[PDB]
Each structure stands twice: as C-alpha cells, then as structure tokens.
Design a protein around this ligand. Structure first.
Ligand code: LMT
Ligand code: BNG
Ligand code: BNG
Ligand code: TYR
Ligand code: NA
Ligand code: NA
Length: 442
C-alpha cells in the first residue's frame, strides 16, 4: 500500500512546496544579515550550484529507486551497510528542525491574527520592535499559535500523500512570489536602497576570513533546499518512473533561490531605510516588515495577504518535515499514518516548547556553549546533521553505487552533465563539506 502522487505535476510542486518556506524569507534574511551579506551570499549561491543541486538530485534518485522511507531506502539499496546513518540522522533532524519551525510559524499566525482583527493598523505605542519582543517573551502566547500551526501540520500529514500533501493550493506560492516582487519593488523606493543593495551584492571579502561564514552559508543552503535529511528521498519515493529528476532538482533549486534573492531585495533596503542593524537576529523580518507595511495606505491589507501567503508556504514545508518521521514510523512499527502523524506531531510540538521559551524566560540557558536552546537546536540540525547527512548521501552514490546505475536511475547519460554530477558526489561536494567542518571546528 505504498502511496504515490496522483498527479503528474504532484511530485515537483510538492518538492517546490517543501523547499520554499520560512527559510527563504525569515532564515535567509537574518543569517545573511549577521554573516555580512554579499560575500556570504556568493558563497551561499556557490553552495547551491555545486552542492545543493547534485545532492538534491541524489535524494530524488535514492527515493525513487527504493520506494521507501529515508531510512528504508538505505536498508534496501545496500543491505547491512553503514550508509543508513544518514537516514537515521535525517529522521532525528526532522524532530529537531520542525520543533522550532513550528514556533516561527506560530509567530506567523499570531501576526496574521493581529492584522485580521485590526490590532496592527497602526504602529503600537511601544513600537514594532517592542511589540515583537513583548509577544515572543510571553511564556504561553507563542505556544498557542505554535500548537495551532502544528495541528494543521499533523492534519495534512495524517490525511495522506494523495489527499493531503498533494492537494495544497497551486495559486498560493505563485501569489507569494508576486507579492514579494511587488514588495521588493516598493522597498527599493524607500531611501535605503543604495546602502541596502551594496550590502547584499557588493562583497566585503574581509568577512570570508572567518570560517564560520562558510559554515553558515552551507547550513542555509542545506536548510533552504530541505536537503541532507532524506526529505527529498521521501518525496521522491512517491513518484514513479514517469518523471525527469534532473530538471526537477534545478527547478526546485532555481525557484528557491529566486525567492531568497527577492526576499533580500525587500528586506535589506527596508532595513537601511529604517536605520536598523542588518544583524538584529531571528525577529528581523517581524520588526522590519510591519513597519514597512505601516508606511503604505493599504498596508494592513498587505500584511494580511503577506502572512497568509507566508503561513501557507511554511505549512507545506512543515508537512514535508513531519513526513520524514511519519513514513519511517509507519514502516518500522506498523503505525498507521494518522497514529504516527498525531503521535510524532504532538511529541515534536513538545520538543519545540523549550525553544519557544528560549526567546524569553529561558533566554539565559545554554546547551551548546554560547548558544541558547533555540540557537543550539538549530545549530546541531542545520550546521551538523544536514551537512553531514548530505556528505554521506553524496558519498553513497559516489562510492557505493556503480556509475551506470547512478546515471540510469537519475535519468542521466555519461554526458558532460552526467560526468559533472558523479564528480560532484565523489569529490567536490563531500570534500567541500569536510573542509568546511575542519576549518570551522578548530
Ligand atoms: C488565524 C487562526 C485563527 C484561530 C482563532 C484564534 C481565536 C482565539 C484568540 C486567542 C488569542 C487571543 O489571546 C489574547 O491575544 C492578545 C494578543 O493578541 C494577548 O495580549 C497580550 O499579549 C500581547 C503580545 O505582545 C501584548 O501586546 C498585550 O499587551 C497582552 O495583553 C492576550 O493576552 C491573549 O490572551
Ligand atoms: C507590481 C507593482 C509594484 C508597484 C510598486 C510601486 C510602489 C512605489 C511607491 O513609491 C512611493 O509613492 C510615491 C511614488 O509614486 C513616492 O513619492 C514615495 O516616496 C514612495 O514611497
Ligand atoms: C535590483 C537588483 C540590482 C542589484 C545591483 C546592486 C549593486 C550593489 C553595488 O552597489 C554599488 O557599490 C558601489 C561601491 O561598491 C557604489 O559606488 C555604487 O554607488 C553602488 O551602487
Ligand atoms: N527548506 C525549508 C525548511 C525545511 C528544511 C528541511 C526539511 O526537511 C523540510 C523543510 C525552508 O527553507 O523553509
Ligand atoms: Na527554502
Ligand atoms: Na513550503
């Protein structure tokens, strides 16, 4: 009873729905902001092209060939071999990443609720920054909107692959892109465009001397592509032979990059027009954008539409996050999808609660030295587990497969592009990750 995408376009739009989410707007902005901007972006773009695309194709190939979960794919294609540690790490990353992903998405629903009830049709007396600090520091209020978002997440994963994940609305992501474009154009007119565009596209190579920039660039690349943890193995495991994987990987990588770049064109000219620091942190878009929406006449309608379309993109991403533990637990314990979605979704919600409290009453607590709970959970998943799982995945096809099977299953020949892809997995991508690890950690 293995489920398959009902529609022909279902797989590619699901992969696009998995990639495009909070990482393109919320995470891309604040990580680019504190990492220096343009020099980080160039390294980030280079990581997309040379590591992101091939390992995305690597995940599609493994999933479609094995027709199993992120862990069962390795047990099936190479029984009794150590490659399944990437599937195990990938399942754990699903727990950790979605635990805090639900919190940031709860921030979305809260802001949408405030616009729908008219609470943000003017700058609150304490300011848009003071409004944001007051909400995220509340111990209970973000939990309610986080729990509300997870209920929707679990509901769609429980309904199934054909009736749930696939049937998300096809106009909302294009409407999100059109809206970001319209906004990015508006922020160009606001006065901080020259300095904001120099920050984003004129590189200061002094920042590159710190190795941590490379680690953040590769963490954002793996994060924004839903990469390295078997999420695309799982989505690919639902598609049949009537599908071209190379174009799917480039389309997903191209669209996700376009969303990221246009988000930066919107955010940072707005950052500089406001005179705010680009290095503010995780609440950057939540302080900058409502202030930006407030200078528009119809801004409250822009805010409603923005956090509706942003919330819908976060929803399709959270669904693919929960889908990795659910498919793994459906097989290995004969759990029903509704049981696994509800049980694992409830547990992941509980795991995120400390990360939500980390923005307030637990703000002084550290797990990894110098990082609070939220920053620690993100670091182990995005900077450790995603890049390492991606390194294993690339080496698996590179050295654990025969080349003819690698090319045949990926719908490639022994062409220049086919040779380029096998070379990326054997050497370029995995040694780039290893070098990033070696230099960052002493
Ligand atoms: C889009 C999904 C819609 C789902 C339906 C939601 C309807 C149920 C409403 C529950 C949320 C309202 O609950 C109420 O919200 C307001 C903020 O909005 C909170 O207000 C409180 O927190 C905010 C956060 O900064 C402070 O600015 C404010 O000074 C403080 O009073 C209330 O303490 C909370 O009790
Ligand atoms: C896809 C549609 C995108 C349209 C975006 C155009 C919005 C730019 C509005 O500029 C604003 O209005 C006046 C110009 O008309 C200026 O005087 C004012 O300083 C400026 O803030
Ligand atoms: C809509 C996409 C447009 C992207 C263009 C962004 C280019 C960023 C570079 O900024 C430029 O840096 C120079 C100094 O480095 C300045 O002398 C110059 O005045 C400034 O313009
Ligand atoms: N790529 C998504 C987040 C994500 C990460 C990993 C996943 O497995 C799924 C989703 C984003 O940029 O918003
Ligand atoms: Na993304
Ligand atoms: Na999404």
């Amino acid at each position: 009873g293995r489920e398959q995408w009902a529609s022909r376009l279902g797989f590619i739009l699901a992969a696009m729905g998995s990639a495009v989410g909070l990482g393109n707007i919320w995470r891309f902005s604040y990580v680019t902001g504190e990492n220096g901007g343009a020099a980080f972006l160039l390294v980030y773009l280079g990581f997309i092209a040379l590591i992101g695309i091939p390992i995305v194709l690597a995940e599609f190939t493994i999933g479609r060939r094995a027709q199993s979960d992120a862990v069962g794919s390795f047990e099936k294609l190479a029984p009794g071999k150590p490659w399944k540690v990437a599937g195990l790490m990938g399942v754990a990353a699903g727990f950790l990443i979605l635990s805090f992903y639900g919190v940031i998405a709860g921030w979305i629903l809260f802001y949408l609720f405030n616009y729908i009830t008219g609470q943000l049709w003017s700058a609150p007396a304490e300011g848009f920054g003071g409004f944001f600090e007051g909400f995220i520091a509340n111990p209970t209020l973000p939990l309610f909107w986080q729990a509300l978002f997870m209920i929707a997440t679990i509901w769609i994963v429980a309904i199934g692959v054909k009736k749930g994940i696939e049937r998300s609305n096809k106009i909302l992501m294009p409407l999100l892109g059109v809206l970001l474009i319209a906004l990015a154009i508006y922020s160009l007119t606001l006065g901080g465009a020259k300095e904001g565009l120099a920050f984003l596209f004129s590189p200061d190579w002094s920042a590159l001397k710190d190795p941590g920039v490379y680690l953040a660039a590769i963490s954002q690349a793996f994060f924004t592509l839903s990469l390295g943890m078997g999420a695309l193995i799982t989505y690919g495991s639902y598609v049949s032979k009537d599908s071209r994987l190379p174009g799917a990987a480039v389309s997903v990588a191209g669209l996700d990059t376009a969303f990221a770049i246009i988000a930066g064109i919107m955010i940072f000219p707005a950052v500089f027009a406001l005179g705010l620091s680009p290095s503010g942190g995780p609440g950057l878009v939540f302080v900058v954008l409502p202030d930006i929406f407030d200078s528009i006449r119809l801004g409250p309608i822009v805010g409603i539409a923005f956090f509706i379309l942003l919330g819908a993109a976060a929803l399709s991403s959270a669904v693919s996050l929960l889908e990795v533990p659910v498919a793994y637990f459906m097989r290995k314990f004969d759990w029903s999808r509704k049981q696994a979605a509800i049980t694992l979704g409830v547990i992941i919600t509980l795991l995120g609660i400390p990360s939500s409290l980390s923005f307030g009453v637990l703000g002084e607590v550290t797990i990894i030295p110098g990082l609070n709970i939220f920053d620690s959970v993100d670091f182990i998943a995005s900077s450790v587990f995603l890049p390492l799982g991606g390194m294993i995945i690339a080496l698996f096809i590179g050295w654990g497969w025969k080349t003819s099977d690698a090319l045949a299953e990926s719908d490639l020949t022994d062409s220049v592009w086919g040779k380029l892809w096998i070379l990326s997995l054997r050497f370029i991508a995995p040694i780039a990750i290893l070098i990033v690890f070696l230099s960052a950690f002493q």
